[PDB]
Amino acid sequence: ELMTHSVSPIGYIRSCFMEKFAIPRQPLLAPAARGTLELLPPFDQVEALEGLEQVSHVWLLFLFHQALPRSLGVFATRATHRPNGIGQSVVRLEGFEAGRLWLSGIDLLDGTPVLDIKPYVPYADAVADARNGIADAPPPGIAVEWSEQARRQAHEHGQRLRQPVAELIEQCLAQDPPEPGRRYGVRLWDLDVHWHYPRPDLIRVLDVAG
Amino acid sequence: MTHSVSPIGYIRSCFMEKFAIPRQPLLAPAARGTLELLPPFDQVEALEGLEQVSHVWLLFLFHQASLGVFATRATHRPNGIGQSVVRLEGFEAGRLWLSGIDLLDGTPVLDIKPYVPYADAVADARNGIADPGIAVEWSEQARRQAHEHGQRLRQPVAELIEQCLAQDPRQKPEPGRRYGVRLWDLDVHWHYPRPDLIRVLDVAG
Ligand SMILES: C[S@@+](CC[C@H](N)C(=O)[O-])C[C@H]1O[C@@H](n2cnc3c(N)ncnc32)[C@H](O)[C@@H]1O
Ligand SMILES: C[S@@+](CC[C@H](N)C(=O)[O-])C[C@H]1O[C@@H](n2cnc3c(N)ncnc32)[C@H](O)[C@@H]1O
Give the DSSP letter string of chain A.
----EEE--SEEEEESBSSSTT--SSGGG-TT-EEEEEE-GGG-SGGGGTTGGGBSEEEEEEE-TT-------GGGS--S--SS-EEEEEEEEEEE-SSEEEEES----TT-EEEEEEE--HHHH--TT--BTTTSS-----EEEE-HHHHHHHHHHHHHHTS-HHHHHHHHHTT----SS-EEEEEETTEEEEEEEEETTEEEEEEEE-
Å from CA of A65 to ligand 2 middle: 27
Taking an 8 Å cut-off on Cβ atoms, the answer to whether B114 and A127 are in contact is no
Q: What is the Cβ-side half-sphere exposure of residue A110, based on CA atoms within 13 angstroms?
A: 12
Task: Please state, in angstroms and rounded to a whole number, the distance separating the CA atoms of residues A94 and A101.
Answer: 8
By C-alpha distance, which of B12, B103, B113, B27 is closest to B63? B103
Three-class secondary structure of residue B78 per DSSP: helix
A11-124: what fold? Elongation Factor Tu (Ef-tu); domain 3 (2.40.30)
Task: Please state, in angstroms and rounded to a whole number, the distance separating the CA atoms of residues A192 and A185.
Answer: 7
> Are B14 and B150 within 8 A, CB to CB?
no
Q: Where are the beta strands (DSSP E) in chain B?
A: 3-5, 9-13, 32-37, 55-61, 81-92, 95-99, 108-114, 135-138, 178-183, 186-194, 197-204
Three-class secondary structure of residue B74 per DSSP: coil
Three-class secondary structure of residue B118 per DSSP: helix
Give the distance, in angstroms, between the CA of residue A185 and the centroid of all CA atoms in the same chain: 18
> Are A42 and A112 within 8 A, CB to CB?
no
Task: Please state, in angstroms and rounded to a whole number, the distance separating the CA atoms of residues B14 and A8.
Answer: 32
Task: Please state, in angstroms and rounded to a whole number, the distance separating the CA atoms of residues A175 and A207.
Answer: 18
By C-alpha distance, which of A57, A84, A58 is closest to A70? A84
Which residues on neighbouring strands pair with residue A39, listed in sequence order?
A: A11
With a 6 Å cutoff on the Cβ, whether B63 touches ligand 2 is yes
> Are B120 and B105 within 8 A, CB to CB?
no
Which residue in chain B is spatially nearest to A101 when comparing CA positions? B70
Measured in degrees and rounded to the nearest 5, phi and psi for residue B53 equal -120, 130
- What's the gap in Å between the CA of A97 and the closest CA on chain B? 13
Disruptive mutation site among B122, B124, B126, B167 for chain A (greatest number of A CBs within 10 Å): B122
Ligand 2 atom having least distance to the Cα of A121: 8
- Burial of A95: CB neighbours in 10 Å, binned 0-12, 13-18, 19+: exposed
Task: Please state, in angstroms and rounded to a whole number, the distance separating the CA atoms of residues A56 and A28.
Answer: 13
CB atoms within 10 A of CB A6: 9
B9-119: what fold? Elongation Factor Tu (Ef-tu); domain 3 (2.40.30)
Task: Please state, in angstroms and rounded to a whole number, the distance separating the CA atoms of residues A151 and A148.
Answer: 5
Task: Please state, in angstroms and rounded to a whole number, the distance separating the CA atoms of residues B187 and B180.
Answer: 7
Give the distance, in angstroms, between the CA of residue B198 and the centroid of all CA atoms in the same chain: 21
Interacting residues of B66 by C-beta distance below 8 A, sequence separation 6+: A47, A50
Resolution stated for this PDB structure, in Å:
2.5
> Are B55 and B87 within 8 A, CB to CB?
yes
Task: Please state, in angstroms and rounded to a whole number, the distance separating the CA atoms of residues B198 and A37.
Answer: 47
Measured in degrees and rounded to the nearest 5, phi and psi for residue A116 equal -165, 150
> Are B107 and B21 within 8 A, CB to CB?
no
Q: State the maximum Cα–Cα separation within chain A, in Å, rounded to a whole number.
A: 61
Q: Mind giving me the DSSP string for B119-165?
A: HH--TT--BSS-----EEEE-HHHHHHHHHHHHHHTS-HHHHHHHHH
Which residues on neighbouring strands pair with residue A145, listed in sequence order?
A: A204
Interacting residues of A77 by C-beta distance below 8 A, sequence separation 6+: A134, B49, B114
> Are A115 and A62 within 8 A, CB to CB?
yes
- What's the gap in Å between the CA of B171 and the closest CA on chain A? 23
Task: Tell me the CA distances in angstroms from A45 to A96, B70, B150, B165, one per residue in order.
Answer: 11, 11, 50, 39
Which residues on neighbouring strands pair with residue B90, listed in sequence order?
A: B97
Q: State the maximum Cα–Cα separation within chain B, in Å, rounded to a whole number.
A: 59
Task: Please state, in angstroms and rounded to a whole number, the distance separating the CA atoms of residues A49 and A55.
Answer: 11
Length, in residues, of chain A: 210
Q: What strands lie across the sheet with A191-199, from one edge to the other?
A: A143-146, A202-209, A191-199, A183-188
By C-alpha distance, which of B194, B40, B161 is closest to A74? B40
Length, in residues, of chain B: 205
> Are B98 and B89 within 8 A, CB to CB?
yes
Which residue in chain B is spatially nearest to A64 when comparing CA positions? B3
Ranges of H-type helices in chain B:
117-120, 140-153, 157-165
Which residues on neighbouring strands pair with residue A104, listed in sequence order?
A: A34, A92
| Per-residue 3-state assignment (H helix, E strand, C coil) for A144-157 | EEECHHHHHHHHHH
CB atoms within 10 A of CB B50: 24
